[PDB]
Amino acid sequence: SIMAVTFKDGVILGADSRTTTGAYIANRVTDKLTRVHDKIWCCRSGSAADTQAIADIVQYHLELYTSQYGTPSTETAASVFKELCYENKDNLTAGIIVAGYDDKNKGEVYTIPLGGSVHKLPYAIAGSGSTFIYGYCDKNFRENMSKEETVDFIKHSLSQAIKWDGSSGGVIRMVVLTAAGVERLIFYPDEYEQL
Amino acid sequence: SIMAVTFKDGVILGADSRTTTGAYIANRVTDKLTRVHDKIWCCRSGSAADTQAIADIVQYHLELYTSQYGTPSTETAASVFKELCYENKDNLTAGIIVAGYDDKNKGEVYTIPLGGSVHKLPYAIAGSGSTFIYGYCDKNFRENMSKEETVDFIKHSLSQAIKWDGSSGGVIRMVVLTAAGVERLIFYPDEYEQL
Amino acid sequence: TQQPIVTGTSVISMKYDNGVIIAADNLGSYGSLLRFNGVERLIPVGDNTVVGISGDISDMQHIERLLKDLVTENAYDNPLADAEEALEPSYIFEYLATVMYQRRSKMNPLWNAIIVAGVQSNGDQFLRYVNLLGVTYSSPTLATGFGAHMANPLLRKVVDRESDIPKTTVQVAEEAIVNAMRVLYYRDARSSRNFSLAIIDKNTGLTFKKNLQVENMKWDFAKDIKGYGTQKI
Amino acid sequence: MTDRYSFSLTTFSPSGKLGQIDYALTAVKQGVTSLGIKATNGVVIATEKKSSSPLAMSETLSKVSLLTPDIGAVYSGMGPDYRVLVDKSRKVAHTSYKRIYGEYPPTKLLVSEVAKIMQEATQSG
Amino acid sequence: TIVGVKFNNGVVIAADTRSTQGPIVADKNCAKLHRISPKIWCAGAGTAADTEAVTQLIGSNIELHSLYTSREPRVVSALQMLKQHLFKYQGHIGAYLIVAGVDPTGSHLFSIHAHGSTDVGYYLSLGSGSLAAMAVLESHWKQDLTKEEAIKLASDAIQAGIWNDLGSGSNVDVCVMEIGKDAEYLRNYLTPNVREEKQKSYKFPRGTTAVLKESIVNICDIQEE
Amino acid sequence: TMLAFRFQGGIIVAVDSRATAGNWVASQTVKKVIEINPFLLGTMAGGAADCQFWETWLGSQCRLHELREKERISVAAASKILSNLVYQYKGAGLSMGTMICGYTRKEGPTIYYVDSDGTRLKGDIFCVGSGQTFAYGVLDSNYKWDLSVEDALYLGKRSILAAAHRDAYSGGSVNLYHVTEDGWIYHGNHDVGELFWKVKEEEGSFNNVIG
Amino acid sequence: QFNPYGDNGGTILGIAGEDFAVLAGDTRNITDYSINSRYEPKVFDCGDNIVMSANGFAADGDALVKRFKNSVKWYHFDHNDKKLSINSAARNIQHLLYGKRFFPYYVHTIIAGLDEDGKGAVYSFDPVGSYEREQCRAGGAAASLIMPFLDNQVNFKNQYEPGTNGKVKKPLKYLSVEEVIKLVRDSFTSATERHIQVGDGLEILIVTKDGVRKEFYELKRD
Amino acid sequence: SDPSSINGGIVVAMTGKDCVAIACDLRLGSQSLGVSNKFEKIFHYGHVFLGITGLATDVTTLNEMFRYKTNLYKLKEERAIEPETFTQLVSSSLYERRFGPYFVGPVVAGINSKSGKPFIAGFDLIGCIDEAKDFIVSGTASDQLFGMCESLYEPNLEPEDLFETISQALLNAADRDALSGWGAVVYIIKKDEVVKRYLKMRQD
Amino acid sequence: MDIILGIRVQDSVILASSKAVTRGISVLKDSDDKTRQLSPHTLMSFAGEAGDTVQFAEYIQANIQLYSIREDYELSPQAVSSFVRQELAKSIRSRRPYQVNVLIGGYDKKKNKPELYQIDYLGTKVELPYGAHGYSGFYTFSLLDHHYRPDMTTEEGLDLLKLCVQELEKRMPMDFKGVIVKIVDKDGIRQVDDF
Amino acid sequence: MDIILGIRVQDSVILASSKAVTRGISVLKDSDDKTRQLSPHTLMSFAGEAGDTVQFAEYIQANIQLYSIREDYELSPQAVSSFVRQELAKSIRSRRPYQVNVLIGGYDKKKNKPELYQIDYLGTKVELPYGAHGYSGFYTFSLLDHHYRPDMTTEEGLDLLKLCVQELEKRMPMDFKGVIVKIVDKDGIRQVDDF
Ligand SMILES: [Cl-]
Ligand SMILES: [Cl-]
Ligand SMILES: [Mg+2]
Ligand SMILES: [Mg+2]
Ligand SMILES: [Mg+2]
Ligand SMILES: [Mg+2]
Ligand SMILES: [Mg+2]
Ligand SMILES: [Mg+2]
Ligand SMILES: [Mg+2]
């Protein structure tokens, strides 16, 4: 269960921490929120191998971009992801959400499903557990939320996704992207289950 | 998208009106809320043929029950459904929700998924579109709601299920079961889409 | 060889006396899930062509880029890029049709069904279809997917043959298109209420209408329908 | 339980008489009069509606019955036996003929089928 | 292409007349409108032998039922008997029907799927041309239709199928079932597909074909004397 | 059906004319004999296109040979060019049956059977195609080395007729050839619709038929 | 799995006269049970007094025709504007088709024109290049309906002269252009009645020493 | 593999003016191999004619079956069966084997002895009736027969003209089919006389 | 391929049947008689699947012998062939069909005519002047099309049969180990011991 | 099954190879020589898939003849057999392998000894006193196990070979149309014209 939400001061990424092999939980403290640039991060879903290999390549492309042309846009990062996912669609199983913060463009979110298409959105949800919260998220999302409101929205949303999806679970990791910097958050079962 | 919800005065059944053959909508004004007894109704999902044949047989069994032993319980109706669904599980594709009103037991809801198992619940959701509202329904359901609150809960819930599920759509039909009698309700797209 | 993931449904179109109309809903489906609700599937090329695309959206976005790049490339060393040597609907179509047939011949198709609608330099109406197989055909009315089965019959009642085109006005044609889009919303399980419509007239040019909705729907008769046969209550 | 009467209840007596058939004919003799007349362009069948009580609605009891659109029947004797014969006669006209040939049977063949049913009740167990 | 349309004081059904084996037209004037009882008619799509046989069987049993009960047959009885029969055979009897009629209860209109599902409606369509027909019905249907408006709508819906669907063609059959009246079966209500005159006659000169033997065939019975 | 046999007066080559696509008779007038050069013949069986294309290609290669070497190609070398070619395409799906019949001074009259499986056989008698068995039956039972050019021509013609009758995928007409020291000689197209009845009457055979 | 082939239906017909030739084809284009176009030309003027049609899978038919037209263009460039004879065109088309022997053009191809002696000529191809000159040939969906009719009414097959009783055949008198067009129109009218993929319109291309002429006729639209 | 095209064969029937005609080829084979050239596919029960194409064992079996049923019909009804009634008997009999069908394509032809009206009909292998006014076709060359009949046929033909039309329809259709031919028979039927002619055709 | 041939001449029927019995890679026997006498003037040869052939032949033989005793009368070859055909036609729609092809050669004492019937395992009966089952016909039919007459003597029929066997021995790939020849005429059935 | 046999006696090697060429249902030829002379004192017989057999044999023949010219020297049978084995061992892992089995019979002029090598299509080489390929060995190996000696003469070897062929003609189902026999000794290679 992964999601990215834009708000007044920027954007927040959120994810669970479960990795499975059938019904066995191979890793219960996985970090699905990964960094491709200082203030451009992604949420990973699907194959762990595919999404890692892709994110590693993108990080390489944006590092080389930065050396030559300066800080890349979030749109530029989404395009590099897309190019990899689209051209290698036959051999990949990767559902990625790209989220970043500019000073000019502020918080932006791009989702990249299986085919390799790109969709810019106010917020995005993905992963097997996202199916159970389409209704909740659509009813409860608002534009220009506060940081505290947005954290609560992600926390409640992923809480339900974890509750119903067997492939989702563990802790709720979150990454906050603003002009202030990069803040990492974590929320444990005892906190979010009782919501 | 089908659901049944118990509340203070009794129980309410709710459903969409779409019937499909692949992506073609064979019937856009289907009645999925069907009567097996005066105050025992069911919600049908899965195969239209299977669920009709089953509901027809159950109605026959409860009519014959009534002639000999008087008004049957909602639990008794659920058992007859179960017996058919369980013993013919290899040849059936029927997901049924049974809901009824007694004066003694008041409003009761029983859900009967594919295998033929029975589960008594405060409220139940089923059908392909139910997947998208597990989160919303869990967060918004309360026990001992009023009639007006329960109607709003079903209306909002099925509204989202219809919004996301292609196999769900049309009008929202509802059936209210109380001591007062049996009330049929209907809600059209222009009303529920703007929610 | 692949399978389509995020898909777009019907694209419908027809000729009228002074031009062509084309329309398509704003939905991007993910199987039975109506996932993206703000997708533009009509893509203008210049002020004389509109390409309507159905099928795989990722391949649609690829084609969208090819056309954008086509405009850029045509402008190179071309002082008459906004005049005599501007891109025509016939040029844009043949380019796409070449690509589609080449891709199917490599067994790696662009999983789409395309309709190029526009008006030529001499004022002639252009309307032609091409799909993932490289199959091409033209007709006074053209539609993809479900539109082929439900819209064409309705649009062919207005323009049944070539001689009916000069007799058909833009108001009558737009009325028919909008009605057809309602019918598809009634009967296509992968359609949306929201859609976009484009008119390319030889006099008034390109009119691109966004955020249209299906209205004047009939549902009231549903209340009278009870059960599936014998149920009186 | 089981129907353990698998033997004939109608048998030949020393004189060569089939008693139960003779006695059945005696029951027919007691029954109300009915008749039939054949004309060049038609046939008529008639009988008396012997009402068992004036409170009884004699319209509800039909002694003359349609078997097919072109065949009718009337009786004398035991009414209940007639009623079930009409039911069987109507059905056999469909199963053994109409569902095969797509048309209603001719009079003589339907009669033959009814006759067969009545013969079997004279020999079966 | 078969349709059913309800109106003020009754119901009307209609059908095309094309019968096909793959891409070949076997019959150019097939009769798809069947009679279950005098005032209950059905239109069938799918496997032709199945729709005919299932229609005759239930029609036979309905007649016997009507005689047993001394009552005019009801549409719900035919509906129930059909769906239970079809359900039993799990879709292997490929009969897709539109059943309509009038009875002491009123006017009725139903559809039946081969697996045994039934649907109720004011307007219905089945067959390969159902989409072309339904597009017309969804565009022009309204509440409180007259008899004349409903026949027009029904035949227009069939025409949509004839012209736009390759599985449908030739003529338009109609049957009108109004309350308190005899049902009127309108065979070849429309004939918009008459073959044009041929350019040439292919009548041969007598003796053109080569023959080896001739003989009289004895069709008569064995003779007297 | 196509046959080719060696005898005293050279070689007889006889073929039918039918072409089918399933049960559909596509043509009754096809040429299954290719005149490669004045002394070389090629027969065709199996894939129509495969046979046509590669046997006309063969003629181009045989012509190039006599340009470079200033001499007519032998039947052995001509047959082997074709067999080596189809062997390269083995497994790809070619379907060909071919008899390369001809005469040269050093070889004499020669027949080679060439197959899309890569088989290349030299021999005195060959019958190939869906009707080979029917032709073999007549040809084998009446064959002698010392037939007259007239009797041999008839036997080959009669053997095709036999096969055209019984084999559903053979028929149309019979094309005859005779190959000698001085090259090949066409001996006409013989429609089966007329030849059958003629043979029946004159020969007194085909009593299975009502005539 | 992706299927690179399709079936666009249609039917075509070529008849050769004594000093002319015709190539006819219906204008309907279909997929499955739907109509794509009621008027989509299928027979083309390829230059040098040659007409051509490639019936079956339209995408392959369009590609082939497009390539042959291109072949004619380059034949002029490379051989001093020499006219491409019908027999030379046929052989060129064999090589175009067989060049894709292992991924075929899924079409039945027919060309018509005049031979080098001025007589009418029709050439027929299978999908992989086998060709043959013929006096008469139908191709496509309704070819099985039409060819037997042409064997009977063009080559007078199974027809004899009355009085002789099977001894003497019907003589093979040549047919005029007016007599041929009647057979073409009747062929397509008959095929339209019994084949669902045939209809809408009929377009005939007639080839003479004077050039290429067109005639169009309506067909039933059901 | 496909039972309907193992043995091969064709049947065609036509109406004329106060007459009907029914014709068949004579071939019986095992795929490519021709076995018999005397296998007639037309039978008659009184004045009703029945042609059957398809799997030869079923053709033989059905003839024996309808001979059986028509003989009993006659004994009970005391009259010969009519074409309209026989047509329904064929349909009934075939549909009772709905899920294990006879692989055949029957064709009924005859004249009603009472009304004098000419009658033809065709069926699919499971019973569906095709009651046509003009003509009926059946067999491996049914496509070919449809094309010939639809172009050559014209209504109200006289017996001696109808013979030529149906004979040419059969002959030219059979010559474009590998599994049909090897002889042919044509029945010309009038209210009280029936002529049977064997046609001379190419034997390949 | 179990070569069985038959030829009907002026006054007799001649049946020839191969002697080899090959099971897999080995020829187990080279003197097998693939025929049974059904009645004094009726002989049936057979070929097909192992076991079924003999089982079927002996079953038919028993039935005809039973008929002969009951009626004190010999059935005509036509009558016997029709009985055999019906058994095979019945068999083809059974649980496990008889996989047997047969030739029935008989002399009708009433009509004073020889008769040859060819029946395959489907129940396909044809009366012929000469017949064969399996691959033998592919060689012999066309050969007999050329050399046969209706007025041939028995000796000419045997010479004609030698011509068939020579062709089969030349062109067929299996060694069928020669044939056993039997003649059926007015005097009954006899075996040609030298062939 | 293309019968090829080989026997090594005191002073020679004898190869026997069937004459039949059967393609499908017909024996196209009955005088085919399934062998090639590689060098004056080395002979190779072969059997396998159509086309491949001759193509392979002639390819090997050409290579050995090339070696002979280059060095003006005849390779030993052992050397030739090793070359052949390597070509087949190379072939088995190719795109399309040679489907050919061979026997190599040679007389080593240096050691004055006859030598017989059996090599299958996989490249499996064995030196043997007697050998066979395909189904022939199933009959002949055990027969030769009983009748063979190392000190046998060429005439005794031929009588022993006649015994093999007689057994094959008795028990094998195909008519292989006899064999061509060739002897390889100190004087070279010669064919036994009467066998
Ligand atoms: Cl990971
Ligand atoms: Cl339902
Ligand atoms: Mg996932
Ligand atoms: Mg929806
Ligand atoms: Mg033949
Ligand atoms: Mg048509
Ligand atoms: Mg034929
Ligand atoms: Mg047989
Ligand atoms: Mg080895």
PDB file of N, CA and C in Angstrom, chain F residues 88-106:
ATOM      1  N   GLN F  88      19.063 -25.917 -47.305  1.00  0.00           N
ATOM      2  CA  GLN F  88      19.333 -24.708 -46.522  1.00  0.00           C
ATOM      3  C   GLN F  88      18.085 -24.235 -45.789  1.00  0.00           C
ATOM      4  N   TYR F  89      16.930 -24.399 -46.433  1.00  0.00           N
ATOM      5  CA  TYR F  89      15.645 -23.978 -45.875  1.00  0.00           C
ATOM      6  C   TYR F  89      14.965 -25.082 -45.065  1.00  0.00           C
ATOM      7  N   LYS F  90      15.671 -26.177 -44.798  1.00  0.00           N
ATOM      8  CA  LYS F  90      15.061 -27.300 -44.096  1.00  0.00           C
ATOM      9  C   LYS F  90      14.610 -26.896 -42.693  1.00  0.00           C
ATOM     10  N   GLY F  91      13.357 -27.216 -42.375  1.00  0.00           N
ATOM     11  CA  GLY F  91      12.751 -26.852 -41.096  1.00  0.00           C
ATOM     12  C   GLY F  91      11.899 -25.595 -41.165  1.00  0.00           C
ATOM     13  N   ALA F  92      12.114 -24.774 -42.193  1.00  0.00           N
ATOM     14  CA  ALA F  92      11.381 -23.517 -42.355  1.00  0.00           C
ATOM     15  C   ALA F  92       9.944 -23.710 -42.849  1.00  0.00           C
ATOM     16  N   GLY F  93       9.670 -24.832 -43.513  1.00  0.00           N
ATOM     17  CA  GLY F  93       8.309 -25.162 -43.932  1.00  0.00           C
ATOM     18  C   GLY F  93       8.060 -25.316 -45.423  1.00  0.00           C
ATOM     19  N   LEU F  94       9.117 -25.384 -46.235  1.00  0.00           N
ATOM     20  CA  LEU F  94       8.940 -25.600 -47.675  1.00  0.00           C
ATOM     21  C   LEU F  94       8.346 -26.978 -47.928  1.00  0.00           C
ATOM     22  N   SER F  95       7.492 -27.062 -48.942  1.00  0.00           N
ATOM     23  CA  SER F  95       6.834 -28.308 -49.305  1.00  0.00           C
ATOM     24  C   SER F  95       6.954 -28.497 -50.811  1.00  0.00           C
ATOM     25  N   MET F  96       7.926 -29.299 -51.238  1.00  0.00           N
ATOM     26  CA  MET F  96       8.130 -29.521 -52.688  1.00  0.00           C
ATOM     27  C   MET F  96       8.472 -30.970 -52.998  1.00  0.00           C
ATOM     28  N   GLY F  97       7.949 -31.446 -54.118  1.00  0.00           N
ATOM     29  CA  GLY F  97       8.273 -32.755 -54.697  1.00  0.00           C
ATOM     30  C   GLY F  97       8.694 -32.463 -56.115  1.00  0.00           C
ATOM     31  N   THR F  98       9.873 -32.889 -56.538  1.00  0.00           N
ATOM     32  CA  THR F  98      10.272 -32.497 -57.907  1.00  0.00           C
ATOM     33  C   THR F  98      11.053 -33.600 -58.606  1.00  0.00           C
ATOM     34  N   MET F  99      10.749 -33.840 -59.874  1.00  0.00           N
ATOM     35  CA  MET F  99      11.566 -34.793 -60.650  1.00  0.00           C
ATOM     36  C   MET F  99      12.249 -33.976 -61.735  1.00  0.00           C
ATOM     37  N   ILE F 100      13.575 -33.967 -61.725  1.00  0.00           N
ATOM     38  CA  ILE F 100      14.378 -33.274 -62.714  1.00  0.00           C
ATOM     39  C   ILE F 100      14.749 -34.297 -63.778  1.00  0.00           C
ATOM     40  N   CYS F 101      14.040 -34.241 -64.903  1.00  0.00           N
ATOM     41  CA  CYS F 101      14.206 -35.208 -65.980  1.00  0.00           C
ATOM     42  C   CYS F 101      14.921 -34.556 -67.150  1.00  0.00           C
ATOM     43  N   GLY F 102      15.827 -35.295 -67.781  1.00  0.00           N
ATOM     44  CA  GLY F 102      16.551 -34.767 -68.928  1.00  0.00           C
ATOM     45  C   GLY F 102      17.517 -35.735 -69.576  1.00  0.00           C
ATOM     46  N   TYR F 103      18.223 -35.240 -70.589  1.00  0.00           N
ATOM     47  CA  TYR F 103      19.201 -36.033 -71.324  1.00  0.00           C
ATOM     48  C   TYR F 103      20.485 -35.241 -71.550  1.00  0.00           C
ATOM     49  N   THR F 104      21.614 -35.925 -71.398  1.00  0.00           N
ATOM     50  CA  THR F 104      22.911 -35.416 -71.836  1.00  0.00           C
ATOM     51  C   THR F 104      23.690 -36.573 -72.451  1.00  0.00           C
ATOM     52  N   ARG F 105      24.758 -36.249 -73.171  1.00  0.00           N
ATOM     53  CA  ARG F 105      25.565 -37.266 -73.844  1.00  0.00           C
ATOM     54  C   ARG F 105      26.251 -38.209 -72.863  1.00  0.00           C
ATOM     55  N   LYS F 106      26.885 -37.644 -71.843  1.00  0.00           N
ATOM     56  CA  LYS F 106      27.665 -38.442 -70.899  1.00  0.00           C
ATOM     57  C   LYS F 106      26.804 -39.218 -69.895  1.00  0.00           C
TER      58      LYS F 106
END
